[PDB]
Design a protein around this ligand. Structure first.
Ligand code: MN
Ligand code: MN
Ligand code: MN
Ligand code: MN
Lengths: 199, 199, 199, 199
């Protein structure tokens, strides 16, 4: 059982003019493809170390497993969080939960925008669901550290603030990239993930 | 006494075709200018906290002080480490030290290249001088963490592997950026820093 | 500003038999005294570095500032959170808040106990108040990293799980130390800190 | 692979009066036993996660794997580095190497002592061999982070500065524990590890 690079659920230029085709093609066919391959390489090395009981090799492989493994997790969710049919505001119970936990939808965007723009270096901004507390929660993750594996929160919406995700189009003005991405957020997908957390 | 953005010792397009003018202009006039301003803002906030004895505010300001403060340190050295008159190999005692500590100049480039390309996320690759041991030493730093402040090593040559330092020209192929930058390394400046470490 | 070691609100043997007198004496007159002394020395160096604009020295002093500065913050709160007249359960809105956010007082004890016992190495277990969300929140901190300075949460009740806090009496059985400390929790002080969080 | 708690090469009271019998008994039968048991449980979970491709579970298990896995590595080496027939100074090439890399045996003790006493919180002080550079090197590790797995250096002599390693006897005065441990250093074992580093 090996991990595979999931196909993009839309054309490279489907999110224009918010995210140009050059960024989408590089972000998926180059960056994500490398994470999957490196992930499969690390898993095979880790399996050999675990069979031999080489705990030293297991720990030496952790940085490569979390970075590439997290990259495969984060980017796989990122594509579904975007869509040419996205934008606007969510509906149903998710919208009610955003108003209840953050006050309003605009306030929520402000909190997630501040968490995303506040990331110093490479990282991610996430809207997650706290299963224990039963409400929403915003958190930032450094580098490719996945949300659930490092915080326990269930990812609902992630914003890649790696420079490779916007620099070609927005250069150093990360806020401009954060303002535009809200227009293509696939709230239908984010709603499916939210409803799955409640039973 | 406030920190200031040092002027670039050459034209934006002096390092072409290795580093295009668009990268140099953005890297200096936008990224570095922000580090200096944010650094001065943080120092003033830290001074107020220190006068009031507010240790909580001091610690809350550490991430902003190390990132912007380190950025001002790293980029100020980075410009002098490059030059249109650079490239080739160093001479004198520095070349002898590289051969003695790393075997050869090509081996040194291999070690610093591996440290630079091995940085997962944002960071820096550095050639430093270990004053205690009296020899050279290669080390990688995450994000803008400066070399001397976090390792004690005296910086001699730094390679910015932040994506903003090469993505516009080399995209995700960081190795291509590392291969080209060796042609514009200002070994005259790196020699001055090395000779200053010995007395 | 010259920080000072606060006088203990009680004699070293007031919390027996839950925390013996030898631990209290060492924890206050040796461990806490060292943080204050080292903190004052570090603050003086930070003042000298700021006057000279030595950013390298500032970053090099951060670990000592956070450890000793956080130690002064944490232990100063720890003494007030304990009392010979403590124990039992809180009353009023704090008890209602514990029931609301954690289900019941017993469930809250189980969650904070797991967080304190879960600390690998040295650290602290904290019950804090999230002013932005307006409810309670449990969090663990590594080493002496203070709660508010590193997380923003306002400390209400802290449990020192440094080995020096229980080893002399409970040895490696940290769970026994967690069970015994509930008998001396000064809920009057925790309520004061909880009321200070509200308008 | 089912890791096992290694038998001690001596009785618990063989290293008296430098390390009393109560510490040795607790450190081996309680502290080290917990790392092995928790390590075996964590490895089993890692095998289950790998078979299912659950990368989230793999990353969530890393802290427990590094702490307990590193604990098994460090303590297993620590017992062999000590002996009732130890003490004094090394001989042969190891002594020459200590003189070459650190000037003298006394200066080496001062450097490794400062590194061990300098650990803030829990950690380890290590004398290691850098195979790439072919000389000795001193390094400190936080918590149970093993030397080779996190730094690449081959461990030669380790000093446990976890509070549980000395507090019962020396209380908060860690320097006294560092001075006393030199009397039981098994330089015969350290030489074997140093000779294994060379062809
Ligand atoms: Mn990305
Ligand atoms: Mn840069
Ligand atoms: Mn303490
Ligand atoms: Mn130990």
């Amino acid at each position: 059982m090996k991990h595979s690079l999931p196909d993009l659920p839309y054309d490279y230029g489907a999110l224009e003019p918010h995210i140009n085709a050059q960024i989408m093609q590089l972000h998926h066919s180059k960056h994500h493809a490398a994470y999957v391959n490196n992930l499969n390489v690390t898993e095979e090395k880790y399996q050999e170390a675990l069979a031999k009981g080489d705990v030293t090799a297991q720990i030496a492989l952790q940085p490569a497993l979390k970075f590439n493994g997290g990259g495969h997790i984060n980017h796989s969710i990122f594509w579904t969080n975007l869509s040419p049919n996205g934008g606007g505001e969510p509906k149903g119970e998710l919208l009610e939960a955003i108003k209840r936990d953050f006050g309003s939808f605009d306030k929520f965007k402000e909190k997630l925008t501040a968490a995303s723009v506040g990331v110093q270096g490479s990282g991610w901004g996430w809207l997650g669901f706290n299963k224990e507390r039963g409400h929403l929660q915003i958190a930032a993750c450094p580098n490719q550290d996945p949300l659930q594996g490092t915080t326990g929160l269930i990812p609902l919406l992630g914003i890649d603030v790696f420079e490779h995700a916007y620099y070609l189009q927005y250069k150093n003005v990360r806020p401009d990239y954060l303002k535009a991405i809200w227009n293509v957020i696939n709230w239908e997908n984010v709603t499916e993930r939210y409803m799955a957390c409640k039973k």
